[PDB]
């Protein structure tokens, strides 16, 4: 995504205040709780039986953190998203076989999480710009599949 | 397919939303028009201003039907047949549009009610909004 | 949601399949393994070579589940509950794969039963399969 | 998408037997019957109220033909599908507002329509090659929502 300078400001303005530890973790857990088939990919992580188990699972949090740092690196290369996510695309396509459809799901869980943390400050306009990022991250993660 | 925990979750959370639904509906609508512009091609005949009074009125009508549905979780086809005739036969809404509004509703709830929007509630609510969507986009009359 | 016209069409065409469900189910699997290789991931323990006897046997089981499903069209959550247990709790099959297998089933049917595969029957069986798929990827008890 | 020489041969060898007058109208008829919200896009085509009305509408048949020779031009330029659909892509994005999820559906419909006509000779290897085609055409047609 080429974002307009207004959108870029809305996004980067809010990113600056995200506890990248908490949030990476909550978005991943919620992914495994809400779309539970996603648990199949994370079997070596421990008990993923109950919502609580998933939200408190240490390995889930740690992986949350990588996911988000990956997102953070994304925010730095906004106008080369496809090349910035080249390597993660191959890994997810050819090594792990995660259908491209789940990336838009994680984007959506991610957006819900940011709404949950920032309530009133997550205004419709700010949301419009995050939908554009997440959509762009998702497309960039899908390059090698098509 | 909604599980019982799903239902006791869906009813629980709607208790809290409750008298505020009217504005959550409008916020949700506003959120969607704004984040997915194509959705506005469905309301050519509406004021889509930020303060819009019709959008508010329509949010209230949306939220009522959602209240209606929480009361009828064991027979949604029965309860929403009229809304289904409207959305499926008459207006012919593309189902992707439901995914967008359903997502914007969740985001709205998350915003106003973080303490009630636990992972599990999130989960039941998403199943709920998508069952509702299947009924509204099915032709079964 | 199915209308009783869908139900009528689902029964009709399934009766026309007759004693051939087994072959169709196997062929449908073959095509899905072959057009969408990543589905094979779910069967690391099978002989997937073409013509395989594990595949024909499994097709027979898939087609019986469908015959079972066609017989309980008013209560698919009830009738399919063990299969939902298997695909949703135990195997955790990505829903996308159900779309893939469903499409390959319809192609299989269209290619063997052209006269029957009328648009209206096509439309019904797709609802049918998507209705089945939802139940098998839902966790409801 | 990205076809091997052998897949190009299956795809081109079948297509020479394809009745371009019948097949496009049958593809589009079925899209409108199976995925009925797609009728909203074609209101000005007549009453579309029954499977039989839809399948006998002469505007449906004639639009169908257009769709299908568009796919033919596609086949003559497999290695640059994006390029050959750039215009069609704008049309369906800015003017018509067609969600790209519907391009996939028309694609699968077309394939079902192929299997219908060709029966036994629509072998799983041949289908596999067409699935790559329709995936690739659905994708070309979508990249102007970027
Ligand atoms: C926004 C989309 C996503 C992004 C940006 C992302 C990012 C990442 C990153 C950075 C890694 C670690 C790679 C490394 O440094 O070695 C990773 C690994 C992994 N990802 Fe994702 N991911 C995303 C979505 C998903 C989804 C939806 C799934 C499953 C449904 C998934 C499954 C996995 C798996 C199984 C691993 C290997 C983890 C391990 O065993 O350590 N990813 N991803
Ligand atoms: C959970 C989702 C939805 C619910 C519960 C819902 C419910 C309703 C209700 C209660 C009405 C009022 C009918 C009346 O009494 O006049 C209505 C009308 C309408 N709906 Fe929806 N709807 C939903 C989704 C959608 C979506 C996704 C769209 C497309 C973006 C849509 C488009 C419309 C339109 C265009 C009208 C008529 C507006 C007017 O002229 O007043 N709906 N809907
Ligand atoms: C309508 C769609 C489907 C039906 C009707 C169906 C039906 C069945 C049945 C009847 C069984 C075995 C029951 C038993 O022996 O106890 C089974 C097992 C299984 N299914 Fe499906 N299934 C469907 C879709 C899928 C899909 C899309 C996948 C993934 C690509 C899948 C993966 C599996 C696996 C891995 C097994 C275990 C087989 C074994 O290890 O012996 N199923 N299914
Ligand atoms: C996926 C393959 C598709 C191809 C190859 C294709 C191709 C075309 C072509 C050739 C035209 C006419 C432009 C002209 O005649 O100059 C057209 C227009 C149009 N397309 Fe598509 N299309 C596809 C999918 C779709 C889908 C899925 C929809 C909506 C369900 C759609 C909706 C329309 C509409 C409403 C028009 C305007 C036709 C008219 O009113 O004259 N198209 N497309």
């Amino acid at each position: 995504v080429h974002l307009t300078a207004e959108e870029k400001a809305h996004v980067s303005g809010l990113w600056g205040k995200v506890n990248t530890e908490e949030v990476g973790g909550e978005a991943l857990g919620r992914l495994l709780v809400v779309y539970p088939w996603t648990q199949r990919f994370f079997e070596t992580f421990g008990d993923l039986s109950s919502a609580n188990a998933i939200m408190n699972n240490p390995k889930v949090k740690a992986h949350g953190k990588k996911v988000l740092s990956s997102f953070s690196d994304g925010l730095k290369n906004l106008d080369n998203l496809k090349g910035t996510f080249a390597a993660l695309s191959e890994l997810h396509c050819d090594k792990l076989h995660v259908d491209p459809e789940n990336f838009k799901l994680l984007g959506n869980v991610l957006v819900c999480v940011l709404a949950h943390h920032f309530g009133k400050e997550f205004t419709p306009q700010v949301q419009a710009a995050y939908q554009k990022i997440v959509a762009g991250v998702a497309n960039a993660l899908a390059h090698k599949y098509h | 397919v909604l599980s019982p925990a799903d239902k006791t979750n869906i009813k629980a959370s709607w208790e809290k939303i409750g008298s505020h639904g009217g504005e959550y509906g409008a916020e949700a609508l506003e959120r969607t028009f704004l984040c997915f512009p194509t959705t506005k091609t469905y309301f050519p005949h509406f004021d889509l201003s930020h303060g819009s009074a019709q959008v508010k009125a329509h949010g209230k009508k949306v939220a009522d039907a959602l209240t209606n549905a929480v009361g009828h979780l064991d027979d949604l086809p029965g309860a929403l047949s009229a809304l289904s005739d409207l959305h499926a036969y008459k207006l012919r809404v593309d189902p992707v549009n439901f995914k967008l509004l359903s997502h914007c509703l969740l985001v709205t709830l998350a915003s106003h009610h973080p303490a009630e929007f636990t992972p599990a509630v999130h989960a039941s609510l998403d199943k709920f909004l998508s069952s509702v969507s299947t009924v509204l986009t099915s032709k079964y009359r």
Side-chain angles (χ1 to χ4, degrees), chain A, chain B:
Chain A
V1 285
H2 306 79
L3 295 165
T4 81
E6 168 71 278
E7 299 180 314
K8 228 196 276 187
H10 291 330
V11 175
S12 293
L14 219 239
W15 204 251
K17 301 194 201 166
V18 147
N19 189 337
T20 25
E21 255 146 15
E22 290 308 301
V23 161
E26 249 256 334
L28 198 76
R30 292 192 179 256
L31 181 82
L32 308 176
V33 169
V34 171
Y35 305 117
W37 62 83
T38 51
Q39 291 160 205
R40 181 179 194 269
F41 295 103
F42 298 103
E43 257 193 319
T44 70
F45 269 33
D47 164 59
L48 309 177
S49 59
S50 126
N52 289 335
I54 294 143
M55 298 311 297
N56 284 305
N57 182 304
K59 259 135 170 58
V60 174
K61 280 106 119 49
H63 188 61
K65 189 157 188 244
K66 317 208 189 169
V67 190
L68 228 70
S69 261
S70 228
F71 223 93
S72 292
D73 282 10
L75 300 184
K76 283 209 256 294
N77 288 240
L78 273 159
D79 49 12
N80 191 18
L81 287 173
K82 289 148 208 296
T84 321
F85 282 109
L88 287 177
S89 177
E90 312 211 6
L91 169 71
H92 285 91
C93 177
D94 302 299
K95 312 297 292 304
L96 300 155
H97 318 286
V98 177
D99 201 273
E101 192 75 356
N102 300 284
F103 306 141
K104 44 111 202 154
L105 294 178
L106 178 45
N108 284 348
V109 160
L110 186 68
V111 167
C112 287
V113 161
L114 304 178
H116 171 91
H117 280 77
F118 296 81
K120 270 194 189 207
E121 256 196 308
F122 208 66
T123 60
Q125 293 81 27
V126 172
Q127 188 201 326
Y130 271 97
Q131 301 300 342
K132 276 209 196 167
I133 309 300
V134 310
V137 176
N139 294 340
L141 268 162
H143 210 62
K144 266 73 191 158
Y145 293 72
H146 33 78
Chain B
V1 177
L2 288 172
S3 90
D6 276 328
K7 294 173 226 188
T8 79
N9 284 333
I10 287 157
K11 304 217 230 55
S13 81
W14 207 256
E15 290 340 356
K16 182 125 263 308
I17 290 138
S19 50
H20 294 99
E23 21 156 331
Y24 300 159
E27 194 187 311
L29 289 165
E30 199 146 285
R31 279 184 185 279
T32 139
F33 293 141
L34 215 138
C35 281
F36 317 104
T38 53
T39 49
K40 308 153 82 194
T41 68
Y42 281 92
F43 303 83
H45 68 302
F46 260 52
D47 186 16
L48 302 170
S49 284
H50 151 71
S52 178
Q54 316 184 62
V55 176
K56 284 194 217 300
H58 193 64
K60 164 97 231 88
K61 284 205 286 156
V62 186
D64 274 353
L66 274 176
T67 296
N68 189 16
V70 177
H72 293 93
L73 297 163
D74 293 356
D75 184 30
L76 300 178
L80 311 172
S81 76
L83 290 177
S84 158
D85 182 85
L86 206 248
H87 291 90
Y89 293 87
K90 232 238 85 197
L91 293 170
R92 285 179 261 199
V93 188
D94 191 312
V96 323
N97 293 304
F98 282 80
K99 276 181 155 139
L100 301 180
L101 174 49
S102 293
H103 171 64
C104 280
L105 231 150
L106 288 157
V107 163
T108 296
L109 298 190
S111 217
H112 298 274
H113 293 277
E116 282 77 29
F117 197 75
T118 61
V121 165
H122 185 167
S124 304
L125 283 193
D126 177 280
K127 282 172 83 162
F128 167 56
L129 295 173
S130 105
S131 314
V132 171
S133 291
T134 300
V135 160
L136 263 47
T137 66
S138 299
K139 335 231 266 202
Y140 59 99
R141 280 285 140 190

